[PDB]
């Protein structure tokens, strides 16, 4: 979270992998513009990414599946 | 000689007095040493270093 | 260095000091007794703790 | 020249009787003035009613012993200190405790005058091991203020106290703990200002908030005498 | 010009933004640590004693 | 609940400045509770009048000198900071000092307004060493509390002063030193009552009784937040 990221590390299992996943999600929320899954609570997108990973709402597989779902739906909207 | 001087000015020959705290107003438990030390402002002004 | 001297001065003891051997109902009234000035910071005492 | 009147921002009730009161902003160096003046008044001058003496049948000393009671006599007196009594009419009451059998002797089992209330009926005075053992004692609730330990009384009063008047520290003041703490208020106007945080905690006889109000009401009255 | 809205924008942009403090010589990896800033009125960095 | 309230007994004015004001009778444990809150308020913030700007004839900045004047304009400004005036009615006055001839220029030579009292008229402002020398200066005296440095003012002031208006730092507060002793009072039955003796040392601009009245007023105003809580 804000002070310690231990819970996120136990949820992913690797400091480095946690950084990569959290950066991907924060990029989604900062540029991609999509809404957070936890309340804002006046935090920078980085910390919302960490908080979401703390609750198990965001895992690398979850990010992959959401991205694939949206991309396949756009490809369906092509036709 | 230091202590003969401290006795001349009616000061604690131990050179160490009872200080009260400024905020809570209650005495510091055990005596503190107080006296005039000569300090020098050096040339390391944070204005020039920041 | 300063924090360790603070901890050492507070968690120490004396032969006969203010509040020598009274019983306290916990840590909170130990703090109350010290602040009130009724017991010295380091004075042997029986306190119930959980 | 009305100085800086603050705004109570946070009333964090952590428990039914333990609170945090955050109060910002104050003129620089007023956090300590107010916090310490309060803390001192709350610690050493708030009035309340507290147990002061106990006569236990079959006992003459605190270091003596009683069979059937799991606790020592010393632990019994210690349990009596943390008794939250509240008297309504008078400045002295004599309660009696009489229990028999097996089970915890909670405060709910005290013979009560109608005008004397007990805040915590679940405060365990002592335990009973054997069913043939019973406990009888005569407790003295007294009204006062501050905190007067046992030694002060035992050396102050010379009157012939009958053998059996085991003597208890009197926690008259209803404040279990108070600790203030002064942070810095980041105000656009000036940052030199400071904010006060008061972790208050009482016994149940009074709420924390009523306790702070009563403390402020005491100091105000003393200063009213000389404010003009 | 340092308007009083610049300071509000600064406190908004500095929240949750870690900043690396370094001291040379950097003999070991604990010589460069990321803190989280608190804006103070002065010209000297303020360091936590324990670190 | 038998709280006995205190009452200013008398002002033991030892010296022109030293005043051992007595304050009794107090409950046990209140001599310090009042005493320290007072001391902090009296020394923390009390209102007084201080020289804020100066303006000497034909002087452009304080790092210069004057002909016939033994001090630099900086030493004159440091001698002016410690000017102890008492402004009766208004809130900002402008005094004028004009003197010529060999001798010390003291604060007794300020052409006094009607409602401006200089309590130490022997406070040497400056020295003139030439018979043809002359100093003419317009000293602005404000009222406030605390210590306001000149830099804070000029940063808070966008107005462009003329080149020649020297800017003195302002130490408004009149109370210099203050101590107290909690002695034991004498009452017929209550022997646990106290009495508080506050010794104040000032510039001579605040009257001790009025100083304590202001301090008690500030404390009572501030405690209103806790009394009428939320």
Curated annotation (Swiss-Prot), chain A:
Tell me which domain of life the UniProt entry assigns to the organism this sequence originates from: Bacteria
Which InterPro entries has this protein been placed in? Answer: DNA-dir_RNA_pol_omega (IPR003716), Pol_omega/Rpo6/RPB6 (IPR006110), RPB6/omega-like_sf (IPR036161)
> What organism does the UniProt record list as the source?
Escherichia coli (strain K12)
Q: Does the keyword field hold Transferase?
A: yes
- In Pfam terms, one family for this protein is RNA_pol_Rpb6
* Any single GO BP term: regulation of DNA-templated transcription elongation
Q: What class of enzyme is it?
A: transferase
UniProt record similarity statement: Belongs to the RNA polymerase subunit omega family.
Q: For this protein, what reaction is catalysed? A: RNA(n) + a ribonucleoside 5'-triphosphate = RNA(n+1) + diphosphate
Q: What's the protein called, per UniProt?
A: DNA-directed RNA polymerase subunit omega
Identify the GO cellular component terms for this protein: cytosol; cytosolic DNA-directed RNA polymerase complex; RNA polymerase complex; transcription elongation factor complex
Classification via Gene3D superfamilies: 3.90.940.10
Oligomer status and interactors: The RNAP catalytic core consists of 2 alpha, 1 beta, 1 beta' and 1 omega subunit. When a sigma factor is associated with the core the holoenzyme is formed, which can initiate transcription. The rRNA transcription and antitermination complex (rrnTAC) consists of RNAP, NusA, NusB, NusE (rpsJ), NusG, SubB, ribosomal protein S4, DNA and precursor rRNA; S4 is more flexible than other subunits.
Protein role: Promotes RNA polymerase (RNAP) assembly. Latches the N- and C-terminal regions of the beta' subunit thereby facilitating its interaction with the beta and alpha subunits.
The record's annotation in SUPFAM superfamilies points to: RPB6/omega subunit-like
For whether the record's keyword set contains Kinase, the answer is no
Enzyme Commission number(s) from the entry: 2.7.7.6
Keywords attached to this Swiss-Prot or TrEMBL record, sorted alphabetically, are:
DNA-directed RNA polymerase, Nucleotidyltransferase, Transcription, Transferase
Q: A single GO molecular function, which one?
A: DNA binding
UniProtKB/Swiss-Prot annotation, chain D:
According to UniProt, the name of this protein is DNA-directed RNA polymerase subunit alpha
Its encoding gene is what?
A: rpoA
Source organism (scientific name): Escherichia coli (strain K12)
Alphabetically sorted, this entry's keywords are: Acetylation, ADP-ribosylation, DNA-directed RNA polymerase, Nucleotidyltransferase, Transcription, Transferase
* Function in brief: DNA-dependent RNA polymerase (RNAP) catalyzes the transcription of DNA into RNA using the four ribonucleoside triphosphates as substrates. This subunit plays an important role in subunit assembly since its dimerization is the first step in the sequential assembly of subunits to form the holoenzyme. Part of the processive rRNA transcription and antitermination complex (rrnTAC). The complex forms an RNA-chaperone ring around the RNA exit tunnel of RNAP. It supports rapid transcription and antitermination of rRNA operons, cotranscriptional rRNA folding, and annealing of distal rRNA regions to allow correct ribosome biogenesis.
In the UniProt entry, what is the domain comment? The N-terminal domain is essential for RNAP assembly and basal transcription, whereas the C-terminal domain is involved in interaction with transcriptional regulators (such as CRP) and with upstream promoter elements.
Name the chemical reaction catalysed here: RNA(n) + a ribonucleoside 5'-triphosphate = RNA(n+1) + diphosphate
Q: Which residues of the full protein are shown?
A: 6 to 233 of 329
Q: Where is this region: Alpha N-terminal domain (alpha-NTD)?
A: 1-228
| Region Required for interaction with Crp at class II promoters, residue ranges | 157-160
**Which top-level enzyme class is recorded in the Swiss-Prot or TrEMBL entry?**
transferase
Effect ascribed to mutating residue 40 to C: In rpoA112; temperature-sensitive, blocks RNA polymerase assembly
Output the PTM entry.
(Microbial infection) ADP-ribosylated on both alpha subunits by the phage T4 protein ModA. ADP-ribosylated on only one of the alpha subunits by the phage T4 protein Alt.
Curated annotation (Swiss-Prot), chain F:
Q: Where is this region: Alpha N-terminal domain (alpha-NTD)?
A: 1-230
| Annotated EC | 2.7.7.6
Organism domain of life: Bacteria
Record's signal peptide: none
The outcome of changing residue 40 to C is: In rpoA112; temperature-sensitive, blocks RNA polymerase assembly
Statement: the UniProt record of this protein carries the keyword Transferase: yes
Keywords, comma-separated and alphabetical: Acetylation, ADP-ribosylation, DNA-directed RNA polymerase, Nucleotidyltransferase, Transcription, Transferase
Tell me one GO biological process term.
Answer: transcription antitermination
Question: Consequence of mutating residue 160 to K?
Answer: 5-fold decrease in CRP-class II promoter-dependent transcription
Chain segments carrying region Required for interaction with Crp at class II promoters: 157-160
* A cellular-component GO term for this protein: cytoplasm
Cite the GO molecular-function annotations of the record.
Answer: DNA binding; DNA-directed RNA polymerase activity; protein dimerization activity
Instruction: Indicate the quaternary assembly.
Output: Homodimer. The RNAP catalytic core consists of 2 alpha, 1 beta, 1 beta' and 1 omega subunit. When a sigma factor is associated with the core the holoenzyme is formed, which can initiate transcription. Both the N- and C-terminus interact with different regions of transcriptional regulator CRP. The rRNA transcription and antitermination complex (rrnTAC) consists of RNAP, NusA, NusB, NusE (rpsJ), NusG, SubB, ribosomal protein S4, DNA and precursor rRNA; S4 is more flexible than other subunits.
Q: What does this protein do?
A: DNA-dependent RNA polymerase (RNAP) catalyzes the transcription of DNA into RNA using the four ribonucleoside triphosphates as substrates. This subunit plays an important role in subunit assembly since its dimerization is the first step in the sequential assembly of subunits to form the holoenzyme.
Q: Tell me the domain comment.
A: The N-terminal domain is essential for RNAP assembly and basal transcription, whereas the C-terminal domain is involved in interaction with transcriptional regulators (such as CRP) and with upstream promoter elements.
Q: What is this protein called?
A: DNA-directed RNA polymerase subunit alpha
Please report the organism this UniProt entry assigns to the protein.
Escherichia coli (strain K12)
Q: Which gene encodes it?
A: rpoA
Entire protein: which part is shown?
Answer: 6 to 235 of 329
